[PDB]
Amino acid sequence: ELVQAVQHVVIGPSSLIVHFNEVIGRGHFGCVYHGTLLDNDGKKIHCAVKSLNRITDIGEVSQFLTEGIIMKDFSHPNVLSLLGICLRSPLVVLPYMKHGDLRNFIRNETHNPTVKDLIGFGLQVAKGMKYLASKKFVHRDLAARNCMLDEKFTVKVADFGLARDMYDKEYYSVHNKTGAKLPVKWMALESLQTQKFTTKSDVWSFGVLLWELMTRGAPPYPDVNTFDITVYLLQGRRLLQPEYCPDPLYEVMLKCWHPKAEMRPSFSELVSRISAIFSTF
Numbered sequence: 001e002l003v004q005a006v007q008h009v010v011i012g013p014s015s016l017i018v019h020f021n022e023v024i025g026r027g028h029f030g031c032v033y034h035g036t037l038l039d040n041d042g043k044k045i046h047c048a049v050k051s052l053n054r055i056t057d058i059g060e061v062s063q064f065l066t067e068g069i070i071m072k073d074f075s076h077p078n079v080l081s082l083l084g085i086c087l088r089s090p091l092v093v094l095p096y097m098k099h100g101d102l103r104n105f106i107r108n109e110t111h112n113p114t115v116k117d118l119i120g121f122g123l124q125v126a127k128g129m130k131y132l133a134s135k136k137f138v139h140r141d142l143a144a145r146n147c148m149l150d151e152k153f154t155v156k157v158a159d160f161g162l163a164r165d166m167y168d169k170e171y172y173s174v175h176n177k178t179g180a181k182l183p184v185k186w187m188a189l190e191s192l193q194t195q196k197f198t199t200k201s202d203v204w205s206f207g208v209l210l211w212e213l214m215t216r217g218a219p220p221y222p223d224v225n226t227f228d229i230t231v232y233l234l235q236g237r238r239l240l241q242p243e244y245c246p247d248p249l250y251e252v253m254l255k256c257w258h259p260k261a262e263m264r265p266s267f268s269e270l271v272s273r274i275s276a277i278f279s280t281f
């Protein structure tokens with residue numbers, strides 16, 4: 001179908017087995033399954049298989065693929081990579097992340113991340129976001145639920161390109177003219193008003209992500225309904241400082257939430273400030 005530059009990452013159906021009995025994720029476009037993939041060197045690796053079987057339209061799947069295929073060119077330790085796609089239900093094959101999504105890991109009681117672990121997680125997210133911003137890539141849905149944690153405690157910024165989906169319906173509003181799915185309590189103030197997204201709106205969401213990490217997965221603005229959120233933000237009210245968040249780190253989040261998008265720090269400035277907080281104390 002049309003251009004075949006996707007043939008560079010096509011995986012043969014005989015090189016992949018999808019364990020349909022083991023669901024590790026559920027998006028709106030399809031579920032995520034455990035998978036077994038044979039490398040080009042003949043090695044068996046764990047992998048996750050995201051299906052897009054809920055979007056059934058020759059034109060709409062083609063636009064999603066060509067819009068998402070850019071992730072094959074991205075390569076950064078804190079950015080989720082594309083192992084390939086299996087054309088058979090256009091399957092997206094992704095590396096398996098042992099600890100799942102970042103928010104579920106830190107919410108789990110039986111896990112004992114330290115205050116320094118949580119700060120380091122946010123520094124990894126900042127490093128991955130700095131890379132994507134360098135490639136002029138806007139990640140309109142940055143949140144703790146949308147980052148992954150692999151075997152070596154390496155955080156991967158996910159939910160973009162062919163991996164983009166709504167994996168937690170609770171926090172999204174579906175605009176009823178455009179198709180846009182809006183994470184209301186993670187969007188910048190100007191995004192709530194105009195529904196356009198920039199790298200500076202990503203910085204706002206990163207501050208909410210940082211706040212999520214320091215509360216170990218608490219939902220932001222639990223007493224502010226999704227209508228009153230825009231006025232709440234217009235009065236200058238912001239998410240309060242978590243109990244175990246260092247003062248210099250809370251000041252970083254406050255910088256991310258400035259009414260003016262040009263006032264907020266770049267992700268490169270965020271990496272510097274967080275790494276300084278990470279090396280001290």
Ligand SMILES: CNC(=O)c1ccc(-c2ccc(=O)n(CCc3ccc4ncc(-c5cnn(C)c5)cc4c3)n2)cc1C(F)(F)F
Binds near residue numbers: 026050097101146160
């Ligand atoms: C209970 N988990 C979930 O509901 C759940 C599951 C997945 C996501 C989520 C976020 C971004 C993203 O790109 N992908 C799909 C791609 C992807 C790739 C490798 C994965 N490797 C392991 C697991 C996984 C899930 N469990 N384990 C023990 C491991 C999920 C993966 C998901 N998925 C988000 C959530 C959610 F946020 F909503 F919490």
